[PDB]
Each structure stands twice: as C-alpha cells, then as structure tokens.
Design an enzyme around this catalytic site. Structure first.
Site, short mmCIF file in Angstrom:
data_model
loop_
_atom_site.label_atom_id
_atom_site.label_comp_id
_atom_site.label_asym_id
_atom_site.label_seq_id
_atom_site.Cartn_x
_atom_site.Cartn_y
_atom_site.Cartn_z
N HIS A 216 -18.98 -57.07 17.61
CA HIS A 216 -17.69 -57.62 16.91
C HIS A 216 -18.02 -59.08 17.53
O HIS A 216 -18.85 -59.59 18.25
CB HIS A 216 -16.34 -57.52 17.59
N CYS B 9 -19.24 -60.41 12.87
CA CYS B 9 -18.34 -61.30 11.76
C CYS B 9 -18.64 -62.46 12.66
O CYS B 9 -18.68 -62.64 13.80
CB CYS B 9 -17.01 -60.94 11.88
C1 LIG Z 1 -17.46 -58.09 11.86
O1 LIG Z 1 -17.93 -58.21 12.90
C2 LIG Z 1 -17.15 -56.47 11.20
C3 LIG Z 1 -18.77 -55.89 11.03
C4 LIG Z 1 -19.02 -55.51 12.52
O2 LIG Z 1 -18.33 -54.76 13.22
O3 LIG Z 1 -20.20 -55.43 12.65
N1 LIG Z 1 -16.49 -56.55 9.98
C5 LIG Z 1 -15.35 -55.82 10.00
O4 LIG Z 1 -15.02 -54.78 10.71
C6 LIG Z 1 -14.55 -55.87 8.47
C7 LIG Z 1 -15.06 -57.08 7.60
N2 LIG Z 1 -14.26 -54.59 7.98
C8 LIG Z 1 -15.18 -53.76 7.34
O5 LIG Z 1 -16.24 -54.21 7.43
C9 LIG Z 1 -14.53 -52.72 6.73
N3 LIG Z 1 -15.68 -52.33 5.64
C10 LIG Z 1 -15.60 -51.81 4.66
O6 LIG Z 1 -14.66 -51.72 4.03
C11 LIG Z 1 -16.72 -50.95 3.98
C12 LIG Z 1 -18.20 -51.52 4.39
C13 LIG Z 1 -19.30 -51.15 3.54
C14 LIG Z 1 -19.04 -50.11 2.40
N4 LIG Z 1 -19.92 -49.69 1.71
C15 LIG Z 1 -21.36 -49.42 2.06
C16 LIG Z 1 -22.01 -48.84 0.99
N5 LIG Z 1 -23.53 -48.70 1.33
C17 LIG Z 1 -23.91 -48.82 2.52
C18 LIG Z 1 -25.20 -48.83 2.80
C19 LIG Z 1 -25.85 -49.11 4.09
C20 LIG Z 1 -24.91 -49.59 4.85
C21 LIG Z 1 -23.67 -49.94 4.68
C22 LIG Z 1 -23.14 -49.59 3.37
N6 LIG Z 1 -21.96 -49.70 3.25
C23 LIG Z 1 -17.60 -49.75 2.03
C24 LIG Z 1 -16.45 -50.49 2.79
C25 LIG Z 1 -13.42 -52.20 6.57
N7 LIG Z 1 -12.43 -53.23 7.46
C26 LIG Z 1 -11.15 -52.69 7.28
C27 LIG Z 1 -12.68 -54.31 8.03
O7 LIG Z 1 -12.11 -54.95 8.78
#
Ligand SMILES: *[C@@H](O)[C@H](CC(=O)O)NC(=O)[C@@H](C)n1c(=O)c(NC(=O)c2ccc(Nc3cnc4ccccc4n3)cc2)cn(C)c1=O
Ligand SMILES: *[C@@H](O)[C@H](CC(=O)O)NC(=O)[C@@H](C)n1c(=O)c(NC(=O)c2ccc(Nc3cnc4ccccc4n3)cc2)cn(C)c1=O
Lengths: 180, 88, 88, 180
Positions: free
Chosen positions: D120, D168
C-alpha cells in the site's frame, strides 16, 4: 558550392548541428509510431520560458547568471522557440508567470515547450528573490508540474514539456572517497 | 463527447545535481550544468532524442575532478521519444 | 590512493503511477503495472535498454479506459544504457 | 533441427525472448562506450530483492499480491538474478532488510541489481504492515536510494540499480476530462 570544413553557424539554428532531410527521414523510419509529432515549421508558434534570479534581498548575487541567460535563450531560439525571459522574481511571482505562460494561446499551435529555472536552491526547491532562512521563499518542483499538466495547461496535452533546473539541492559536495 | 485524459503526462525534468547536493557556477563562465547541457544539445539534437541527450550530459560528469555534480532526470512521463529535428 | 566518487549515480526508479494518484490491482490477476512491466521486459529485454522498455510501458498506459494510471520514472542517474542481454 | 513456430520457453530464461549472439554483438557495435558492462555468465552472482506486503494490521489485505510475487520472482530469475523475497514488513524491517541486502558479498561479483517494492502507498511513501493514519509506518523512496548509493553500498558503485515500486501515491484517480 559550400565547403564542409567551414560549418555554417550563421542561420537561425546558430551552433546547433542540423538534422539533414535524410537523417530526419531515417529517424522516423526506425520508430515513427513512438516519436512526438512535430508541427509545420512555417506555421507553428513554439514558446519557451526562462526564469532566472541573479539579485536577491538576503542571499549572495549569482554572478555569471547573465551568461546562462544568454546561452539558454540563444539555444532555445536555435531550436525554434520564442523565448520569454523573466528575472528576479519571488516564488509568488514565479507562480503568476508560470500561470500566465500556461494561458498563452501560442501553445495551441505549438508541438512542445521548454521551461528553464535558474536560481539559488535548497533541498525543498528553488529560491525566490526574497528567500531567507528566517522567511522562506521557495518554489517547489511539484508546483511547476501542476501548473503545466493536462488540467492546468490543456493546450499542451500530449506535448513534451521539458523542465531544466539549475539550482543547488542542498549543502553537500555529493562525493564519497574510495580506494583507487 | 467528453473523454478522460491522464492529468500528468509527457513531462521530463532535468536538475543540475542529485538531491542534497550542490551544483557549480563560475562568476564569468556561468553554470557548469548549463554550459554542458548547451554543448550537448548543440552536438546531439540532430541525432538523439532528449532523454538520450540528458544521459550523455550525465555521463560527461562521471569522473569528478574537484567540483562534483551529477545531473538527474526526474518525474519522467514522456511516452514517446522527443526528437528536436533542428533545421525542421 | 583515495579517489572521489559521486555519492549517488547509476540509479533508476520506476513507480506504478504519477504523484498523488492511485495504481490498480485485481484480486486474482495482480497489479496492472506489474503485469504490464513483466510483459514488456519479456518482449523487449532482448533489444531495448531498460529506460526504453520503461518508456514503452508508459506508452501502453496512454489511452485510459476506466482505471487510469501513468507509471513514472524517477531520480534517474544512469550514465549508460542498461541492456539486460537475456541469454548472456 | 528446431521449429521457429514452437518457441522455446523451457530454459532458465522462461518467457523472456533471448538476445541472439548476432543481436548482442550488434547492440555493442552501435554504442559500446555507453553501455553498462556485463560480467561473465559462468561466474557472476547477480542478486535481486523483492519486498512485498499483503497482510496489514490496520488496512485492507492486498489480495493478488502473491501473483505479483510469482511474476516478478520468475522474471528476475529469467534475467539471471538470484532473488530474495521478504514479506509483511514494517518500514523499520524494510530498512534492516535493505541494509542487509547492501551488505551482501555477491554484489562485488555482480554487474547490477533490481529492488522491487510492492505495498500500500500514500503520497509520502510505501506503507509498512503496521501503517495507520494515527501512527504512520512509511518507508520513503529517498531512504531506499540512500541505503543503496555509492557510500552505503560500495559493492554496487558504477553498477545499475533498478528500483520498481508498485504502490498508490495518493488518493486521486489521475484524470481530467476534455472535449473529444
Ligand atoms: C494502491 O496501493 C492500490 C494498489 C496496490 O495495492 O498496489 N490501489 C487500490 O487498491 C485501489 C485503486 N483499488 C483497486 O486497485 C481496485 N482494482 C480494480 O477495481 C480492478 C483492477 C484491475 C482490473 N483488471 C485487470 C485486468 N487485467 C489485468 C492483467 C494483469 C494484471 C491486472 C489486471 N487487472 C479490474 C479491476 C479496486 N478498488 C476498490 C480499489 O480501491
Ligand atoms: C547552487 O545553487 C550554486 C550554483 C547556482 O547558483 O546556480 N552553487 C554555489 O554557489 C556553490 C557550490 N559555489 C560555487 O558554485 C562556486 N564555484 C566555483 O568554485 C567554480 C565553478 C566553476 C569553475 N570552473 C568552470 C570551468 N569551465 C566552465 C565552463 C562553462 C561553465 C562553467 C565553467 N566553470 C570554477 C570554480 C564557488 N563557491 C564559493 C560556491 O559557494
């Protein structure tokens, strides 16, 4: 009927070595899909900004700063930019100038920009003319990026924005000894 | 219709030294970094993209002889090569 | 005898997004940036230096379709091209 | 007697496309004086470090982090690095691990390194497992550079140090609307 041993430095590009038509076409034919597009020479209105502080209220004069203004202004003109030169500004004045610069209509008919900042500096950022340890006058690099980004400078969306900074970033000599 | 765009993209910053460290300036010859950058843009704008020119400037500072400084590229979001095509 | 060396040199950092902004991660597919970086290193390590590969990764994030993120290269002091020469 | 349509992904390099001897020699003959030197494959001891936090005391689990560990570990091994994987650390633990990593004798017989941080994150830096808004547990990128620089990691002097960060950098979506 020219002599290759007598290089022409007398054009608008001055001492900048020219990119031949053959070299320009070679550069494109290698990775065209991954080069920033350049606008028509006859109609583009490229702009560049130079902010340089030489005279300060509470810190020493940056003697030689005029030599830097000369060199960077001529270089940026040689590269095809119309150059604005703003001197001896506070961080507030720099913000106002940068905001005015982002508002310039010429960017809409330009393919890129250069911003050059030259002043005293500390770890935190660039010194404005009123800077003192007691009452800081600092422009942070983060503020420069914010004022020129896709939101605050929509005319430069998808266009390269080159920022040059000449300023100390602290008080260290930046060296370590090693056994040679 | 409206479309989303990256808020920050297509930037490159080039600083005269690494964080915490000084840069040098001569009273009549100017700033070392500025003079070095101008020399490199003059020689290499015709054939190298700006990121490559900046690397060549960093490389010219490598052997420190009394006034060490290492120019640094920062917060880079160029997605393409930026060729200046001097003369075009 | 002793010789001076730059305290900070030959680094490159590559972050998953621009400052202030989020990066995305899927519960079973992992982080978008990681997956994209692995795909690009696999395809381009043979022919591109790391700075070029990183630019190609940034370029693949350009058209934002719902989960925008722009990976950024930071605090770059590489003075040479870093080719991985996979297989050597 | 191989089939070009059946790519070999069965070697130590796995899915990483190989650099042919001809391509390797071509890459060198173009700009040899400006490429980082690579050490003998038979004797070099390349190292890489992966630090990844999935489980936290006060913030949500980073589900999918194991997929990132798998992909980056296999990639770094494919590129010739021996990989250490450290999980669920506080910022203090990360500092201790990075310091231990900089102390590794293998770097003396290595030509480069990769550090990968996945956790995170907030604007300030990378979250350690104990992070909360109340009591922050943050590792700053500045500390990573300091621990691996020419002074604190002399074995890696003049060698490329690639740092990868998946985290992030705030709470914004990083977008602006424009008229298409
Ligand atoms: C910030 O530190 C974090 C990321 C981390 O922990 O490193 N961000 C979050 O937690 C935040 C923005 N976040 C998400 O990322 C969520 N993600 C989605 O909604 C989501 C992500 C990705 C996909 N699709 C996808 C498709 N093909 C892929 C191929 C390879 C790798 C990944 C792929 N991902 C769909 C949805 C959700 N929430 C709630 C959230 O807070
Ligand atoms: C930090 O912000 C400033 C630089 C600035 O104002 O932008 N740094 C200092 O003021 C500080 C480190 N500093 C100096 O820079 C001094 N400089 C010298 O001692 C000095 C500089 C350069 C040369 N030589 C030289 C040779 N060829 C050149 C060609 C082109 C351009 C410049 C060239 N310079 C010799 C000496 C001195 N002091 C006291 C100091 O505090």
């Amino acid at each position: 009927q020219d002599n290759p041993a007598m290089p022409t430095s007398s054009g608008s590009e001055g001492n900048v070595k020219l990119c031949s038509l053959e070299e320009a076409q070679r550069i494109w034919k290698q990775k065209s899909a991954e080069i920033y597009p350049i606008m028509d020479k006859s109609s583009r209105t490229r702009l560049a900004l130079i902010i340089c502080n030489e005279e300060f209220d509470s810190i020493p004069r940056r003697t030689g700063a005029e030599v830097d203004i000369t060199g960077m202004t001529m270089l940026l003109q040689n590269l095809g930019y119309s150059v604005d030169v703003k001197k001896n500004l506070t961080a507030s004045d720099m913000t106002t100038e940068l905001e005015a610069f982002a508002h310039r209509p010429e960017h809409k008919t330009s393919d890129s920009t250069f911003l050059v900042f030259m002043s005293h500096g500390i770890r935190e950022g660039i010194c404005g003319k009123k800077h003192s340890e007691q009452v800081p006058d600092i422009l942070q690099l983060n503020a420069i990026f914010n004022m020129l980004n896709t939101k605050n400078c929509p005319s430069l969306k998808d266009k390269p924005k080159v920022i040059i900074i000449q300023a100390c970033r602290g008080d260290s000599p930046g060296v370590v000894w090693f056994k040679d | 219709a409206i479309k989303k765009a990256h808020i920050e993209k297509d930037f490159i910053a080039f600083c005269s030294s690494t964080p915490d460290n000084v840069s040098w300036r001569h009273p009549t010859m100017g700033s070392v970094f500025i003079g070095r950058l101008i020399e490199h843009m003059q020689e290499y704008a015709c054939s190298c993209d700006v990121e490559e020119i900046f690397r060549k400037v960093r490389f010219s500072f490598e052997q420190p002889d009394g006034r060490a400084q290492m120019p640094t590229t920062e917060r880079v979001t160029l997605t393409r090569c930026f060729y200046l095509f001097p003369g075009h």
